[PDB]
Design a protein around this ligand. Structure first.
Ligand SMILES: *C/C=C1/C(=C/c2[nH]c(/C=C3[NH+]=C(/C=C4\NC(=O)C(C=C)=C4C)C(C)=C\3CCC(=O)O)c(CCC(=O)O)c2C)NC(=O)[C@H]1C
Length: 311
């Protein structure tokens, strides 16, 4: 059973209670983007990341309480029709914005209950179809693993891309990797289950991609921290901008990893493994490339089942 989050008087997490961290409700985001929450009916902005005003070039006093009708006149009607009350929380509305203060922005919106969760990130399929085909054309499980890591590395430029496979006891093993010259091998190395604790593995079965763009960057809180609709935490399990567990951030820093990203491989409704990526320098993977990775994760998941059937 989860501890209360830090902003509800909960304790800072230690190695004695890894699995009790409520990672889905950190009440804060990573600073490379901005997040707003809004009422699902009225479009009233209910919460904003502390950096939202500066990030969007808006006046802090104007942004809170303002409506999505006023802030996003060209998207609001499309947004409403796309995400009606009761829709699956995995369902997304995406748009590209031309925003003077921040340049081209990717907007990603989801609904949870009566709340809309809006993520703004800077933004800039021939390669995708080729990548899809390379996975399918892979002859066996090992080659599929190898092609997957190589293809993901080519698409992303990440210093290391691993296929990290979970054993029945939830320990992990790197079973394939593609790596930059000079990086030491993790191939064949195994890791305790506690390195990716049970509540993370659970979240990763439902929300299939997560990342930390800068492992040294302080989280940016949401204000107000609680959803005013409910006087309860804002569900951020489906927000890629959500803050990463400090326990994990520390693990990455100690490994010399500045940027981390993984994609779930789900086989038969169970978490089979992860496409796990590292960069030494902080690194924001373009929003369009993340969508490509999401498609490739789905393809790999299908192909792992197919290839395991071949034996
Ligand atoms: C006491 C808690 C601990 C803890 C928590 C923790 N770890 C994660 C997430 C991940 N851990 C990963 C581990 C590895 N990455 C690697 O490259 C290797 C080995 C080469 C390992 C073992 C991975 C891949 C993740 C997924 C996230 C990612 O891809 O960056 C979480 C959940 C983080 C979040 O989503 O907010 C948590 C709470 N890890 C520990 O070691 C202990 C201290």
């Amino acid at each position: 059973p989860f501890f209360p989050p830090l902003y509800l008087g909960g304790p800072e997490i230690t190695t004695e209670n890894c699995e009790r961290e409520p990672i889905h409700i950190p009440g804060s985001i990573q600073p490379h983007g901005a997040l707003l929450t809004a009422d699902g009916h009225s479009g009233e902005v209910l919460q904003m990341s502390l950096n939202a005003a500066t990030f969007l070039g808006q006046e802090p006093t104007v942004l809170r309480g303002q409506t999505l009708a006023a802030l996003l006149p060209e998207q609001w009607p499309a947004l409403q029709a796309a995400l009606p009350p009761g829709c699956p929380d995995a369902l997304q509305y995406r748009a590209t914005l031309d925003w003077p203060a921040a340049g081209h922005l990717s907007l990603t919106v989801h609904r949870v209950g009566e709340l809309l969760i809006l993520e703004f990130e800077p933004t800039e399929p021939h390669a995708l179809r080729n990548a899809m085909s390379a996975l399918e054309s892979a002859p066996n499980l090992r080659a599929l693993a190898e092609v997957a890591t190589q293809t993901v590395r080519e698409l992303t430029g990440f210093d290391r891309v691993m296929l990290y496979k979970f054993a029945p006891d939830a320990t992990g093993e790197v079973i394939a990797e593609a790596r930059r010259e000079g990086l030491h091998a993790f191939l064949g190395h195994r890791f305790p289950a506690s390195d990716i604790p049970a509540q993370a593995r659970a979240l990763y079965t439902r929300h299939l991609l997560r990342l930390t763009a800068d492992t040294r960057a302080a989280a940016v809180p949401l204000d107000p921290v609680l959803n005013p609709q409910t006087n309860a935490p804002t569900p951020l399990g489906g927000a890629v901008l959500r803050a990463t567990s400090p326990m994990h951030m520390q693990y990455l820093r100690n490994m010399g990893v500045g940027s981390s990203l993984s994609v779930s491989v789900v086989v038969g409704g169970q978490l089979w493994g992860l496409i796990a990526c590292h960069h030494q320098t902080p690194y924001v993977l373009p929003p369009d490339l993340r969508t490509t990775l999401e498609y490739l994760g789905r393809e790999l998941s299908e192909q792992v089942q197919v290839k395991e059937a071949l034996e």
